[PDB]
């Protein structure tokens, strides 16, 4: 429960952010958060330091993909349930990770709220 | 669980760094943190926005006055028990929330390793 700066051990940090389908019905948030074959997402994750990865039922983007890897049973794609979200992950010692999922998060917002005021 | 940038509750990030006097026998830590009549620690909430405590046996720097509070049973001073350590709290949004957090771990890093190479 306490935090050791000292600590061999780093920590982690994940969330998983929705993607508010409900609040933008229309818009391709999958679409701009990958990237022409991923490179938006990539990009990001570079830029950032941290994964980040887009989960959830919609996220591969072929209603007939996602149906049958769900239906096949496998648990790598469990999520595939789940409502529709960014889930990011960062280790570090306490001030790196907090530093990198603030990048994430940050980073993540502009594209979950896209007509936010610059 | 899922956070919802669009959740009308603020999120809270709570984390309980432990000074380091194990590893800095002899430094005055709770003094260079409070600073004179607590101006440091008034002027590192100020810049990073969050709240800033420090809690635990020796964080009143008298142990007598310490003795007394904890004797008196006042579930107020309980924490003067714990390990020496600082409190960070912090509210907001998602992206706020971890920026700040990240803002105040950082500074509080210098503080906590003192030798650190700038």
Known sequence: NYLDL???K??????????????????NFVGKIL?????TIKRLQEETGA???VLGKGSMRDKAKEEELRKGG??????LNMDLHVFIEVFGPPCEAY???A?????????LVPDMMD
Chains 1, 2 share one sequence.
């Open 6 to 8: 000292f600590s061999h």
């Open 10 to 27: 780093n920590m982690k940090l994940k969330e998983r952010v929705l993607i508010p389908v409900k609040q933008y019905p229309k818009f």
């Open 35 to 39: 990237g022409p074959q991923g490179n």
């Open 51 to 53: 994964k980040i990865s």
């Open 74 to 79: 496998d648990p790598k794609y469990a999520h």
């Open 99 to 101: 530093a990198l999922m």
């Open 103 to 111: 990048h994430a998060m940050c980073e993540v917002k502009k594209f």
